[PDB]
Amino acid sequence: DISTLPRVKVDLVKPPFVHAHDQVAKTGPRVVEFTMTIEEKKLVIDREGTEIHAMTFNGSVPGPLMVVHENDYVELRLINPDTNTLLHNIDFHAATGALGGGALTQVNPGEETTLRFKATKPGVFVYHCAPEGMVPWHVTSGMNGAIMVLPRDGLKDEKGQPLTYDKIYYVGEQDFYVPKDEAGNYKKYETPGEAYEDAVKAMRTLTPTHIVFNGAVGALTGDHALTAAVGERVLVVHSQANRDTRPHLIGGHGDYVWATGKFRNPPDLDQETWLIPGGTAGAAFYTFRQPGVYAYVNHNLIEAFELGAAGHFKVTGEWNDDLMTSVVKPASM
Amino acid sequence: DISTLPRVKVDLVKPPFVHAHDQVAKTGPRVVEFTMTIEEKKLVIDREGTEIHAMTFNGSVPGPLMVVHENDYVELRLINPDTNTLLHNIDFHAATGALGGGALTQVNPGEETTLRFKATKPGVFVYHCAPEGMVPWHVTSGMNGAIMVLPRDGLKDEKGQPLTYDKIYYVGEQDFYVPKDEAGNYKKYETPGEAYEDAVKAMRTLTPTHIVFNGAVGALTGDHALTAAVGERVLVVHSQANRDTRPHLIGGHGDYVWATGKFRNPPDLDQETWLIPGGTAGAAFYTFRQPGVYAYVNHNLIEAFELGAAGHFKVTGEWNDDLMTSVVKPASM
Amino acid sequence: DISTLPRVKVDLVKPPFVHAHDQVAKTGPRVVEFTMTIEEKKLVIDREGTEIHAMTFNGSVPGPLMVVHENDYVELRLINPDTNTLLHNIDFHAATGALGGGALTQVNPGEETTLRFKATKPGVFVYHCAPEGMVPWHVTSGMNGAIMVLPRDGLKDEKGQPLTYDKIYYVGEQDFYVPKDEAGNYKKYETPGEAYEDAVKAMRTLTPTHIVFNGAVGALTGDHALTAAVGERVLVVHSQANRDTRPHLIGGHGDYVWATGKFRNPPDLDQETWLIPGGTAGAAFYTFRQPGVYAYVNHNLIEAFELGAAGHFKVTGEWNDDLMTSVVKPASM
Ligand SMILES: [Cu+2]
Ligand SMILES: [Cu+2]
Ligand SMILES: [Cu+2]
Ligand SMILES: [Cu+2]
Ligand SMILES: [Cu+2]
Ligand SMILES: [Cu+2]
């Protein structure tokens, strides 16, 4: 009887941060309560000022990372305020049945719904909006995020030993398809209905105009760079709801990676770069060994440096000259 | 002496069905005899009525799934009737030598050949036509399928325990490159020779016009949806002879997946989505837990919902409200 | 004290060959000294005579394979002669800190630098140039290669048994983005500065004009085909610094594959085709069983046969009719 179980209300945070949780479950199974409010909003996604009509869970691209343990129940209150214009729903890749919940969570503006599902499989998973007939449009408008279902005894390495992270970040990578005119400039649209056919045309090119982390070019840079200290263990959860990516920590590695994100599998060790297929979340665990600026990218470097799929870590601490040093600094022949 | 071995004649079926076989070999090694007849034919591939000149093994896109056991011999009689206009051959990725058999199976219209190879490696494998100088043209005209080489003791999980499927389906995914004029409409062609240069141009865009399951948009929907019952164990073999895909069961998982299709490797567990590289067959084993309509897609959702890479399962049985339920149905604030 | 360690100078060779090394380390840790000289040069990359301004390490695309053992120190003298016009540097994916060395190795024409890093992780790894603000331009101009960090006790199979190769080759796969005019012909450029914007435009299409092995269409064919004998164990290291590939030995397999290239992981067995993500090196070990011509391809067959990603092996030895035979040669009905 699910009513006999503890209920715990989670208060979500904006990516790339992650709400408070315990790696190792400190209670038995729980009903873990989440509320997300759908927000359609304009977002500026690049340095040029390109503005799109984004479709968000909880106001962000990506939507927030939800965290539970295996065999918890996830109970989501999904709210579609009447300030929105479109119907939305949600497909949880962590869930079993009804198109991941999509068939049960169709909410018009001015409606809400509450879905519960049992999180039977441990891993990081994509969640995304998926309204019948307009699935890729919602997803590539930003309407996706991820959920992490931790093993009840936390993460393990390839030998069954504990892996415990000190910090966790969630990098949502978004492929956008801003319609272009024949000369190559972005078009603008008066209504979602008027935008739809040109959105479809743009999607069918299979060529994103923008590929961004945390909803915009440069979002995880400057004062919003990711941070860590030398010696800290960091888990980076990375999702891509629609298109393949290949994450890479420039200057580091994925010490332990679940590239397709499912923790009953042993991790791959020492990855330089890993492929997260579109429609998947993956997770990489790294212990920083060197201070300084790192760049965290999709290692299609065009996608990273021209289209936006690059963020930074600023790492504090001691430099280790045994691990790397400039023996002779750049100088003239 | 191969002549001392049993010979068994297989009678193939049209995808997504699979000819009768035993998971665990009930005999010693056999020469397993297959006949396929090449058919060049017009096919309508979308709802608009777009008609292409397809190149098929046995009249279907994909060609049929062939099933043997490890260390059986596959003996294929390949027939190219004089009603066809082109030369064809076959590359079995399961085979060793002579370009997978391609160098030994060049048949002009009005010819046939018989190839034998030993199936030394267990797995699902792509087979495809590959005539020197026109390889991608044949493959992206539909001229590919798959062969499953089962371990003699059937499939095993990651711990060495048996995995036994109740039902098997074969999903062949086809990237087509229908040539477009500058305005974006599909062109039509009088002869394969006249079509060739525009086919090459279209292929070189690396942007499929269509990506379909079982040879057409909607082929695995309606009365031709895949079926299962709650509690049934289903193996879905999925091939892509030319281009990456990322399969996903919307509402389910791959409980055990061999993403690159080779059964001497332990499967990956609990996959949401998995990458089958172009030129590969993969296999996913799932036990259904919920009834209803599922969609089985390439989770590049543009490729699925706009370009055609989507099919359905209709699953019968009991709904499990513990696993998923609508706590509060969509209703007004 | 690194000064107390042996120093060994390596003399590099041009791909696809690999400098002399020992699989199992015959000494303790060493400082392994490499020198590479940057060369900007014109290269003809196709049969049409298309000429690009390539950016190379040591005069080749790809740059040479460097080989060390785990816990050796790699000490690279990187020379940028004043005959070059651009600034360059190097990111070693094998290294930890300073953007893989990129932050420490910025050399203008007429400068050199020496970088040392400890090779703490075994695997094959990409190295590439990565100057701030022009990273994909350098990489997709050919300025990348690979480094293999062998386990000190050489390679192991999935059971911990030794795998010893008889021959090793390095296949560097390069995506080029030669700018096109609206009619589709390649443009030519007077200076790297004048070329830059059109290079960026071309890259942003995400559609390579050329995808080649060893720097040109047909480079690993004819008198420069790879060779082997029946019964020889061959390791093929394959890198792609910017874009996914899917290698396949036509007529063979990857008996043991580290698709993402890191040797602390067990290899995948019996691969037909494997995905090397862009920004990664992978390695495939195969024992040849049949003589003849093999084709080694990216199994996006358009990328292979139309865009250039195909090479050959010529294998000498005995044909095995048990493994494959033509039972009935192509003949008329
Ligand atoms: Cu939506
Ligand atoms: Cu989905
Ligand atoms: Cu053919
Ligand atoms: Cu092939
Ligand atoms: Cu450079
Ligand atoms: Cu890199």
Residue numbers in the entry:
A (entry chain A), B (entry chain A), C (entry chain A): 8 to 340
Task: Please quote the authors directly.
The enzymes are homotrimeric, with two cupredoxin-like domains in each monomer that harbour one type 1 copper (T1Cu) and one type 2 copper (T2Cu) site. The catalytic T2Cu site is located at the interface between two monomers, with a (His)3–H2O ligand coordination, while the T1Cu site is located near the surface of the protein. Two residues, Asp98 (AspCAT) and His255 (HisCAT) in Achromobacter cycloclastes CuNiR (AcNiR) numbering, that are conserved in all CuNiRs and are located either side of the T2Cu, are required for enzymatic activity. AspCAT is hydrogen-bonded to the copper H2O ligand and also to HisCAT via an H2O bridge.
The SF-ROXOX structure was compared with the 0.90 Å resolution synchrotron-radiation (SR) structure of AcNiR, revealing conservation of the overall structure with an all-protein-atom r.m.s.d. of 0.29 Å. The T2Cu is ligated by a single, highly ordered water molecule (W1) bound in a distorted tetrahedral geometry relative to the histidine plane. The active-pocket residues HisCAT and Ile257 (IleCAT) were in similar positions; however, there were marked differences in the positioning of the AspCAT residue and its hydrogen-bonding network. In the SF-ROXOX structure the proximal conformation of the AspCAT side chain has two variants of the proximal conformation compared with a single proximal conformation in the synchrotron structure. The additional conformation is formed by a 34° rotation around the Oδ1 atom, with the carboxyl Oδ2 atom forming a hydrogen bond to W1 at 3 Å, while the Oδ2 atom of the original conformation makes two hydrogen bonds to two water molecules, W3 and W4, one of which, W3, subsequently hydrogen-bonds to the T2Cu-ligated W1. In contrast, our SF-ROX structure of as-isolated AcNiR reported here shows that the T2Cu is ligated to a water molecule. It is the first time that this catalytically important water has been observed in a crystallographic structure obtained using femtosecond pulses from an X-ray laser. The distorted proximal position of AspCAT seen only in our SF-ROX structure shortens the hydrogen bond between the Oδ2 atom of Asp98 and the T2Cu water ligand W1 from 3.5 to 3 Å.
